[PDB]
Amino acid sequence: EVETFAFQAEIAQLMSLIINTFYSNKEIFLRELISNSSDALDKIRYESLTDPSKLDSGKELHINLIPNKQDRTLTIVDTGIGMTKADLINNLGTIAKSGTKAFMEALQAGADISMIGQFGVGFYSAYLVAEKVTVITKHNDDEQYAWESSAGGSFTVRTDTGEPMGRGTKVILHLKEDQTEYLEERRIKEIVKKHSQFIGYPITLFVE
């Protein structure tokens, strides 16, 4: 059974700006997601310092990029801290609420969309290239949950029955018909090489 939620007003607005604004430099979506993963892996490593049973759901701290031309998805996978139901629903909404104000104010003063990460809402940039984003996530303190949204101002959350993941976050980007360049190996390593080369964690680009 699937619960449906309404984005906070500001977030909805943020997500139409990103979907509507002519802006050709879409590749920035990937470092925003990868850097989100870097932060979630940081957080579980720190926490496992003072409580090593927290890595009982997986030791390896890594990031995986996975293109699948057949489903037309690019998945970003990490084994960081994962998110609880309340983060998915309420917490991540409550915080990206100021970020979205600042960001929008900046956006006329001639900031542009690629500055979205320095306001803490990098994630929504995934709508530069995805028509639907699905987030499977699993936190030590909660069940594995699937979050999903095609924008339009609503999101669904349901407890996930897929392959169990142990602990971490998968962002599955269901790509727009015209954004399939991001499923290409030489394209992806170009962007990682240019934008994400100093990430403190192994990043693997799976081949198809």
Ligand X SMILES: Nc1ncc(/N=N/c2ccccc2)c(-c2ccc(Cl)cc2Cl)n1
Chain contacts with ligand X (rule: CB under 6 A): 36-37, 40, 78, 80, 83, 87, 91-92, 96, 121, 123, 135, 169, 171
Q: Cβ-closest residue to ligand X?
A: 40
Binding-site entries:
36, 78, 97, 123
For ligand X, which is the closer residue by CB, 91 or 154? 91
Q: Is the separation of the CB atoms in 88 and 109 below 8 Å?
A: no
Beta carbon of residue 47, minimum distance to ligand X (angstroms, whole number): 11
Beta carbon of residue 96, minimum distance to ligand X (angstroms, whole number): 5
Specify the residue for token string 């976050």. Answer: 169
For ligand X, which is the closer residue by CB, 69 or 98? 98
Beta carbon of residue 40, minimum distance to ligand X (angstroms, whole number): 3
Q: Is the separation of the CB atoms in 171 and 31 below 8 Å?
A: no
CA nearest to 199, candidates 33, 38, 27: 38
For ligand X, which is the closer residue by CB, 88 or 175? 88
For ligand X, which is the closer residue by CB, 83 or 191? 83
Beta carbon of residue 188, minimum distance to ligand X (angstroms, whole number): 17
Q: What are phi and psi of 43, to 5 degrees?
A: -65, -30
Binding-site entries for ATP:
36, 78, 97, 123
Query: Going by C-beta distance under 8 Å and a sequence separation of 6 or more, which residues neighbour residue 23?
Result: 112, 113, 128
Q: Is the separation of the CB atoms in 23 and 113 below 8 Å?
A: yes
Q: Is the separation of the CB atoms in 152 and 5 below 8 Å?
A: no
